[PDB]
Enzyme design. Structure first.
Site, PDB file in Angstrom:
ATOM      1  N   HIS A 160       8.384   0.827   7.369  1.00  0.00           N
ATOM      2  CA  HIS A 160       7.877  -0.285   6.570  1.00  0.00           C
ATOM      3  C   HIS A 160       8.986  -1.070   5.879  1.00  0.00           C
ATOM      4  O   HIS A 160       8.684  -2.067   5.215  1.00  0.00           O
ATOM      5  CB  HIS A 160       6.812   0.193   5.563  1.00  0.00           C
ATOM      6  CG  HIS A 160       7.312   1.083   4.458  1.00  0.00           C
ATOM      7  ND1 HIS A 160       8.084   0.621   3.412  1.00  0.00           N
ATOM      8  CD2 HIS A 160       7.062   2.387   4.185  1.00  0.00           C
ATOM      9  CE1 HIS A 160       8.322   1.610   2.565  1.00  0.00           C
ATOM     10  NE2 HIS A 160       7.710   2.694   3.010  1.00  0.00           N
TER      11      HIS A 160
ATOM     12  N   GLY B 225      11.605   2.060  -5.056  1.00  0.00           N
ATOM     13  CA  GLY B 225      12.928   2.192  -4.484  1.00  0.00           C
ATOM     14  C   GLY B 225      13.229   3.564  -3.908  1.00  0.00           C
ATOM     15  O   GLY B 225      14.296   3.750  -3.304  1.00  0.00           O
TER      16      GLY B 225
ATOM     17  N   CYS C  95      11.595   5.237  -1.510  1.00  0.00           N
ATOM     18  CA  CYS C  95      11.247   5.491  -0.118  1.00  0.00           C
ATOM     19  C   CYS C  95      12.494   5.803   0.690  1.00  0.00           C
ATOM     20  O   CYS C  95      13.566   5.235   0.458  1.00  0.00           O
ATOM     21  CB  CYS C  95      10.520   4.294   0.484  1.00  0.00           C
ATOM     22  SG  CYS C  95       8.892   4.120  -0.207  1.00  0.00           S
TER      23      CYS C  95
HETATM   24  N1  LIG Z   1      10.886   2.338  -2.073  1.00  0.00           N
HETATM   25  C1  LIG Z   1      10.439   1.307  -1.833  1.00  0.00           C
HETATM   26  C2  LIG Z   1       9.858  -0.073  -1.516  1.00  0.00           C
HETATM   27  C3  LIG Z   1      10.759  -1.140  -1.381  1.00  0.00           C
HETATM   28  C4  LIG Z   1      10.291  -2.427  -1.090  1.00  0.00           C
HETATM   29  C5  LIG Z   1       8.920  -2.658  -0.937  1.00  0.00           C
HETATM   30  C6  LIG Z   1       8.019  -1.594  -1.083  1.00  0.00           C
HETATM   31  C7  LIG Z   1       8.481  -0.299  -1.352  1.00  0.00           C
HETATM   32  C8  LIG Z   1       7.380   0.785  -1.517  1.00  0.00           C
HETATM   33  C9  LIG Z   1       6.256   0.768  -0.681  1.00  0.00           C
HETATM   34  C10 LIG Z   1       5.229   1.706  -0.843  1.00  0.00           C
HETATM   35  C11 LIG Z   1       4.017   1.669   0.117  1.00  0.00           C
HETATM   36  C12 LIG Z   1       4.282   1.442   1.478  1.00  0.00           C
HETATM   37  C13 LIG Z   1       3.228   1.391   2.395  1.00  0.00           C
HETATM   38 CL1  LIG Z   1       3.553   1.086   4.120  1.00  0.00          CL
HETATM   39  C14 LIG Z   1       1.915   1.574   1.972  1.00  0.00           C
HETATM   40  C15 LIG Z   1       1.651   1.798   0.618  1.00  0.00           C
HETATM   41  O1  LIG Z   1       0.304   1.977   0.245  1.00  0.00           O
HETATM   42  C16 LIG Z   1       0.074   2.471  -1.063  1.00  0.00           C
HETATM   43  C17 LIG Z   1      -1.464   2.509  -1.231  1.00  0.00           C
HETATM   44  C18 LIG Z   1      -2.179   3.331  -0.139  1.00  0.00           C
HETATM   45  C19 LIG Z   1      -2.116   3.841  -1.594  1.00  0.00           C
HETATM   46  C20 LIG Z   1       2.695   1.848  -0.320  1.00  0.00           C
HETATM   47  C21 LIG Z   1       5.335   2.650  -1.856  1.00  0.00           C
HETATM   48  O2  LIG Z   1       4.324   3.592  -2.066  1.00  0.00           O
HETATM   49  N2  LIG Z   1       6.446   2.628  -2.699  1.00  0.00           N
HETATM   50  C22 LIG Z   1       6.567   3.647  -3.747  1.00  0.00           C
HETATM   51  C23 LIG Z   1       6.549   3.326  -5.108  1.00  0.00           C
HETATM   52  C24 LIG Z   1       6.685   4.367  -6.041  1.00  0.00           C
HETATM   53  C25 LIG Z   1       6.848   5.694  -5.621  1.00  0.00           C
HETATM   54  N3  LIG Z   1       6.857   6.000  -4.259  1.00  0.00           N
HETATM   55  C26 LIG Z   1       6.722   4.976  -3.319  1.00  0.00           C
HETATM   56  C27 LIG Z   1       7.494   1.710  -2.562  1.00  0.00           C
END
Ligand SMILES: N#Cc1ccccc1-c1cc(-c2cc(Cl)cc(OCC3CC3)c2)c(=O)n(-c2cccnc2)c1
Ligand SMILES: N#Cc1ccccc1-c1cc(-c2cc(Cl)cc(OCC3CC3)c2)c(=O)n(-c2cccnc2)c1
Lengths: 305, 306
Positions: A41, A143, A145
């Protein structure tokens, strides 16, 4: 003596973490041999993530759209492809700090260490378990991921988790390093929820053995039980079933302590039916289920890496 | 989201751990630049553990009585000296993996990461806190002496603990990296006992703020308290006194959550009176006191879940 939630030393993995930037998105990558692994992603805009067609989105990208930074050094991307939900970025230099490693897929109940990272820089380490509902109760901010989970065996790092998403209840979902999700989750911004969780019975038993080794034994009693009788109790209290494999796995701890598994099962049954009488076990007022039998043996014997 | 006992990544410290042997005694040392630091009781023998005279034991040693092994490489000792309860072995090689570092002596209530090591090799990493009674509740087996505790705020390792002894209650005593013990302990096997311990009140309040940041308010109430009335109650539960310094240190968390510090003190007073009534806070059924205010800001989001 003492008993702590203990992670593996993280140095072998710290030397593998890099920063991956695609457009306005920055997250973490894992650099092993001449490939950088990260969540696919990374290539999505926020609108893309609502309903992504990853193959189509990746066609627009070329190697120079992926900025990879190892410390202060820029890495040159010479190829890109997907495996399931992971992006693989081939670079022109093998990581000189690549440890002996392999990719493994773990099962619910197994534990691992997480190296939480931001902008390619390791920031913290802690111990996690794969829950029965295939989430992990991690600690992650935006950040994070691409942070990874791992175990160490002698000299070999076994990578088992890459972080992808936070769910609405604040627990976390991710893939193995071949990009296969743990649990019924998809990498799309859409309505998803952790299922009802259960308690990892074999790990609670392992931790009771750790307690006895450390001198906490007020919960021992004269009674024993059978696997069939205990599993009815486990089911009532939303504990996972105990199998004969679990009994055998508790062998080394049942040897080190000299207490039979079904003996200890009678202790756990009484704790489930009556609670703790305002007492604690290894400093906890809950029945802890994120120590495996191997974790207990590892910590009580001083194995090194 | 989430909240775990989070250590610092240990690699910067792993690269400094070595094995030190004198006689039949082996333990761990810390190799920074061209000096190896280790507990001075490496020069004791089993017979002389109750009242060792370290000055007399050390003058009988030459440099080559100390074997220092870094991985599979023997380092050559070219000098030795004692500073308080730490031995400093000068070696003829500077450690090429020496990180940016400093030595800091910490106050009770402060936390740090511990890298438990045996035979100069790391075993695992965990979080600890300096208890009010100057012990730590570690996890240490025979051979762990010379393992260290540290923080790595920014890019710099601050070493604050070196492990020397296990006490009869199973808790641990040691020194700063200048060799001065925390608390009243001495490095000999004469009868010693940890004093009565207390709960680190400012840390419990920090952890309640973490709970609010992560989205739970069930334990708050409509009341407030004076600082003195709070301390009069809290001390009846074996809690440490809360000072105006502690109130000041909680300011940033108070500002982020909109909960005045003395209002959170009133919540804690009611939690001590009521218990949790079958609920949990951040995965615990007890009031946790080994997260500092600084730890909570380090780990938690800057945006509260309202
Ligand atoms: N890093 C990073 C980052 C950098 C740039 C843009 C985005 C992200 C990002 C994306 C997700 C995410 C991605 C997909 Cl594909 C689906 C999704 O769906 C959630 C909903 C179904 C329940 C969430 C995410 O969860 N985080 C995040 C935040 C806090 C703690 N852990 C993860 C960070
Ligand atoms: N390593 C190592 C090692 C290698 C060779 C020989 C001995 C040791 C050794 C020594 C002590 C010790 C040393 C002194 Cl000077 C006084 C003392 O007094 C205890 C009593 C007053 C209360 C204890 C100790 O505590 N451990 C140890 C064991 C388990 C966990 N942590 C530490 C290990």
């Amino acid at each position: 003596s003492g008993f702590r939630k203990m992670a593996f030393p993280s140095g072998k993995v710290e030397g593998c973490m890099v920063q991956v930037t695609c457009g306005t998105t920055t997250l973490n990558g894992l650099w092993l041999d001449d490939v950088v692994y990260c969540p696919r992603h990374v290539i999505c805009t926020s609108e893309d993530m609502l309903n992504p067609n990853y193959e189509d989105l990746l066609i627009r990208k070329s190697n120079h759209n992926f900025l990879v930074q190892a410390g202060n050094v820029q890495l040159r991307v010479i190829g890109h492809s997907m495996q399931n939900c992971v992006l693989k970025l081939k670079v022109d230099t093998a990581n000189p700090k690549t440890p002996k490693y392999k990719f493994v897929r773990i099962q619910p109940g197994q534990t691992f260490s997480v190296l939480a990272c931001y902008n390619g820089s390791p920031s913290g380490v802690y111990q996690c378990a794969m829950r029965p509902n295939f989430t992990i109760k991690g600690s992650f901010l935006n950040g994070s991921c691409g942070s990874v989970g791992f175990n160490i065996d002698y000299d070999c790092v076994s990578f088992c988790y890459m972080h992808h998403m936070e769910l609405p209840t604040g627990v976390h979902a991710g893939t193995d390093l071949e990009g296969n999700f743990y649990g019924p989750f998809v990498d799309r911004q859409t309505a998803q929820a952790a299922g009802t969780d259960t308690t990892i019975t074999v790990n609670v038993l392992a931790w009771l053995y750790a307690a006895v080794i450390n001198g906490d034994r007020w919960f021992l009693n004269r009674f024993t039980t059978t696997l069939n009788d205990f599993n009815l109790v486990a089911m009532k209290y939303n504990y996972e079933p105990l199998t004969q494999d679990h009994v055998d796995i508790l062998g080394p701890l049942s040897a080190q302590t000299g207490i039979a598994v079904l003996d200890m099962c009678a202790s756990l049954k009484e704790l489930l039916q009556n609670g703790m009488n305002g007492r604690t076990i290894l400093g906890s007022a809950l029945l802890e289920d994120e120590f495996t039998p191997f974790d207990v043996v590892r910590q009580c014997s001083g194995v090194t890496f």
